[PDB]
Structure formats: C-alpha cells, structure tokens
Design an enzyme around this catalytic site. Structure first.
Site, PDB file in Angstrom:
ATOM      1  N   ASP A  35       1.560  21.715  29.483  1.00 18.47           N
ATOM      2  CA  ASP A  35       2.966  21.791  29.151  1.00 18.47           C
ATOM      3  C   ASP A  35       3.781  21.566  30.390  1.00 18.47           C
ATOM      4  O   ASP A  35       3.939  22.512  31.061  1.00 18.47           O
ATOM      5  CB  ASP A  35       3.238  23.183  28.582  1.00 18.47           C
ATOM      6  CG  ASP A  35       4.664  23.280  28.077  1.00 18.47           C
ATOM      7  OD1 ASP A  35       5.427  22.265  28.097  1.00 18.47           O
ATOM      8  OD2 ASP A  35       4.989  24.338  27.638  1.00 18.47           O
ATOM      9  N   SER A 199      16.818   8.620  34.793  1.00 18.49           N
ATOM     10  CA  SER A 199      16.499   7.262  34.398  1.00 18.49           C
ATOM     11  C   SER A 199      17.679   6.356  34.689  1.00 18.49           C
ATOM     12  O   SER A 199      18.831   6.778  34.625  1.00 18.49           O
ATOM     13  CB  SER A 199      16.165   7.244  32.906  1.00 18.49           C
ATOM     14  OG  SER A 199      15.989   5.931  32.405  1.00 18.49           O
TER      15      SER A 199
HETATM   16  N1  LIG Z   1       7.718  22.334  26.025  1.00 17.39           N
HETATM   17  C1  LIG Z   1       7.595  23.239  25.074  1.00 17.39           C
HETATM   18  N2  LIG Z   1       6.624  24.142  25.195  1.00 17.39           N
HETATM   19  C2  LIG Z   1       6.422  25.045  24.242  1.00 17.39           C
HETATM   20  C3  LIG Z   1       7.178  25.097  23.112  1.00 17.39           C
HETATM   21  C4  LIG Z   1       8.193  24.176  22.957  1.00 17.39           C
HETATM   22  C5  LIG Z   1       8.427  23.216  23.930  1.00 17.39           C
HETATM   23  C6  LIG Z   1       9.492  22.166  23.779  1.00 17.39           C
HETATM   24  O1  LIG Z   1      10.398  22.512  22.767  1.00 17.39           O
END
Ligand SMILES: Nc1ncccc1CO
Length: 330
Positions: A35, A199
């Site tokens: 993530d 960007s």
């Molecule tokens: N990046 C993320 N990690 C965990 C839950 C949701 C998101 C993005 O909305």
C-alpha cells in the site's frame, strides 16, 4: 541486501494486488496488499473479532517464538475510502521476497470494517508511504521499507504491477530488464506523508497533449485513477454514451464501447494507459453499463494515481534522503 516478490491480482478486474509475506518464527505466510497510500503493516490475527474473519489467513503471535507484545501500543487507522481497522501491536521478524527485517511492528487487528471482512483474499496491508503517517500510539512505528532501508543495496523499491497478470515488487535494486526506454525521475513532496508528485499534463487517445500541472499521489492501494473533474470530463466526452451517474457513484459507459487510451506526463516523458485498462466491467452482474477506471477527485481533496495508472509503468519509489519517483514505460 535485496528482496523480490511476485504480486498477484486478487480478481479478474485487478481490484487490488496481494504479495506473500513471511511473519514470525516459524514463518506464517500471509498475503498482504502493499500500500503506497498508508504507513501501517497490519494483519488479520488470532485477536481479530471472530465474526469479522471470513476466510483470511491469520497471524497467531503466540505461535511465533520471535513475537513480542509492544507494551501499551495501539493502532487505529481510517482510510480515504471509509474502511478502517484497529488493534494492538507486536514486533516480529518479517520477510518479503528474501529480504528480512527483525523487530518490525506487526499491527494485529482486533477489529476490521466490513469491506476488509468481505475480501477473503487480503490478509492485511503493508504500508509503504512515509513513516510519519503510521498510526501506532503512543510511539509511532517505522514501515517495513524504512526499517530495511539501511541494509538495502540502494534505498529504493519498485512497483511493476501487471494488467490481468502477476507483477513484481523489488526492494533494494532496479531491474533494468523490467522496463523499456529510460526512467524519468520527478520530485516528491513528503509534506503530507505520501509519494506526492506533479504530473506535467495529459492527453486523451490520439489527441494533443495538454500541458498542465496535476499534483497527486502514487497510491497502489487505490484501484482507480482519480483526477480533476475537467480532465475526467474531457476523457469521458470521447466515449459515446458515457455519463456520470450519481446513483452508481461515478462515470459509467456502455460495455460495448472501445475506450481511448489516456496519457499522463512525467516531466517531458509520457506514460500511456491503454483503453482496456480503464474498463472495470459491469456495474452489477449482467449489466451492460460498465464502470470507468478514471474518476473525478473533486470529492477527495487530492488526485490519486492508483493501480490503473501505475500498472502502465515501471515505478521507482526512491527513498534517498531527498525522495523522488521514477516512471518508465514497459
Ligand atoms: N490506499 C488505501 N489503503 C487502504 C484503504 C483504502 C485506500 C485508498 O482509498
């Protein structure tokens, strides 16, 4: 040191990607959702409310001879999409693709929200944003990357996400066989704790490139590409029958349409997202209305270069003293 691990889409739409991670001694392998948008490594566990576990693999710290309760530490995270989880904290050995960190904070969920329960394929999340966003209290904890950084051959990790196919996360080196052309690096702001960059503009299909600064974050935990309403309207105006649906929650388009590509600028370089990558399929089973992969950020507060954009590139997350991002075509 280095590490290299395959990341695999959880479903036929590439809604998210899971990467196997070894936790504890003997190893407990959990499939985590890496993530770029968060700084907590949290897992379903033997402590998770039983009614909130539905098919996930759990971490059981009592079975790990290297687990230690981090006394007094708790965590609670609320994500940008409204999902949440919370619990307590252990330290343990964590290995990704052969790269091992000892004393990593492993956040054990006591509670998770419904969307985490309903995703049987995701056993937790491994945050790769900056450690300033970590939610552990009263002592904030470091991400896996931050802990590994000093040991790595180079203080970098790369994301090479596949379209309807497996891909790779590498730590500590740049696989020069994994991309075409050169990597264009661009400045990062860490002021919000994200891999935030600007960007240089966009094009729709074969149209002319519009030079315009678009600030946003490189978030592999977001499925889609969220951009300013002007940009998104210009994209969907090129798809006959496409419209923004308040009831569905975004732009939808006829499943019979062929979508144009979308190009985003990285300095003077250009990354082309093929049209197919923007098709997220029927809004409900059997529907001929399909959900678009480019959506407005107007209600978010930030633009988000999620999986739709990132999977079109080989992406370097350079964690040098002054971090930068690199993008190459592939
Ligand atoms: N990046 C993320 N990690 C965990 C839950 C949701 C998101 C993005 O909305």
């Amino acid at each position: 040191s280095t590490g290299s691990a395959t990341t695999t889409p959880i479903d036929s739409l590439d809604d998210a990607y899971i990467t196997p991670v070894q936790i504890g001694t003997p190893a407990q392998t959990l499939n985590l959702d890496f993530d770029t948008g968060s700084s907590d490594l949290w897992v379903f566990s033997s402590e998770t409310t039983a009614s909130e576990v539905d098919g996930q693999t759990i971490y059981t710290p009592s079975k790990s001879t290297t687990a230690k309760l981090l006394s007094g530490a708790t965590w609670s995270i609320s994500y940008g999409d409204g999902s949440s989880s919370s619990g307590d904290v252990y330290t343990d050995t964590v290995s990704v693709g052969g790269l091992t960190v000892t004393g990593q904070a492993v956040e054990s969920a006591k509670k998770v929200s419904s969307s985490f329960t309903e995703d049987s394929t995701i056993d937790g999340l491994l945050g790769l944003a900056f450690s300033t966003l970590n939610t552990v209290s009263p002592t904030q904890q470091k991400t896996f990357f931050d802990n590994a950084k000093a040991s790595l051959d180079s203080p970098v990790f790369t994301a090479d996400l596949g379209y309807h196919a497996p891909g790779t996360y590498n730590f500590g080196f740049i696989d020069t066989t994994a991309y075409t052309g050169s990597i264009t690096y661009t400045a990062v702001s860490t002021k919000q704790g994200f891999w935030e960059w600007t960007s240089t503009g966009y094009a729709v299909g074969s149209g002319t490139f519009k030079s315009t600064s678009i600030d946003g974050i490189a978030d592999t935990g977001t499925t889609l590409l969220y951009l300013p309403a002007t940009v998104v309207s210009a994209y969907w105006a090129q798809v006959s029958g496409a419209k923004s649906s308040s009831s569905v929650g975004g732009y939808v388009f006829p499943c019979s349409a062929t979508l144009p590509s979308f190009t985003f600028g990285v300095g003077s370089a250009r990354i082309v997202i093929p049209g197919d990558y923007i098709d997220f399929g029927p809004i409900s089973t059997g529907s001929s209305s399909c959900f678009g992969g480019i959506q407005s950020s107007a209600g978010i507060g930030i633009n988000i270069f999620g999986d739709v954009a990132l999977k079109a590139a080989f992406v370097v997350f350079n964690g040098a003293t002054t971090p930068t991002l690199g993008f190459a075509s592939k």
